[PDB]
Amino acid sequence: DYSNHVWQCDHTRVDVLLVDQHGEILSRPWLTTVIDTYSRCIMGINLGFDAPSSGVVALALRHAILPKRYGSEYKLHCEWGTYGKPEHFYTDGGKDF
């Protein structure tokens, strides 16, 4: 019925091969998204090599629930003015969830 009423979360394998800072191949990361079902903002993400795990879920949840701050190395013109807790959380059946 309103914003934050149901957040939704899932993970997927990003389709970019990453590299170490020394330049050698690192297998693709996983991306986790937390999404407002009303508003349809993306509320927060976690991007990393760690497989789908409750610590990864918790890491996306932290970013989503908390206010956002980014420095000038992020050349943003907008601002990611979204925060606050969900009232419900809607997921698939993964063992992390």
46 binds DNA (CB under 7 A): no
Is 15 within any annotated ligand binding site? no
Shortest spacing between CB 50 and DNA, in angstroms: 12
Judged by CB under 7 A, the number of residues near DNA is 8
Task: For residues 37 and 25, give the distance between their C-alpha atoms in angstroms, rounded to a whole number.
Answer: 36
Tokens at residue 40, please?
Answer: 């349809």
Shortest spacing between CB 38 and DNA, in angstroms: 23
14 binds DNA (CB under 7 A): no
Residue from 11, 34, 57, 60 that binds DNA (CB under 7 A)?
11
Which residues are CB-contacts of 30 (< 8 A; sequence separation ≥ 6)? 11, 12, 13, 14, 47, 48, 49, 50, 51, 52, 56
Residue with tokens 């925060």: 83
Which residue ranges are tagged as binding site for Mg(2+)?
A: 10, 92
Q: Which residues bind DNA (CB under 7 A)?
A: 10-11, 51-52, 92-95
